[PDB]
Ligand binder design. Structure first.
Ligand SMILES: [Zn+2]
Length: 66
DNA sequence: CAGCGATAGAGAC
DNA sequence: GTCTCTATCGCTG
């Protein structure tokens, strides 16, 4: 609905992180951030969310031009 | 033109 | 030396 606010802040229902380069979701339609959706889907087992970090290593980019 | 999945790399001990 | 975790890329419609 145009309010652009499901609630307001699209939040990871698994780790509450507001900072992420790509928003993922759970096969059940629940929103996830980058690592939760990528890790939970790949591992398929509960996980000490304590591995979570508010600091993300910025990587380079295989970009250039041509 | 934008978004997503899958794969691969690096670090620490 | 090995294992694990996470992010970015390329491709398509
Ligand atoms: Zn998350």
């Amino acid at each position: 609905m145009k309010n652009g606010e499901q609630n307001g802040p699209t939040t990871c229902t698994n780790c509450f992180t507001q900072t992420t380069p790509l928003w993922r979701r759970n096969p059940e339609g629940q929103p996830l951030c980058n690592a939760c959706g990528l890790f939970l889907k790949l591992h398929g087992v509960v996980r000490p969310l304590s591995l979570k970090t508010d600091v993300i290593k910025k990587r380079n980019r295989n970009s250039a031009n041509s």
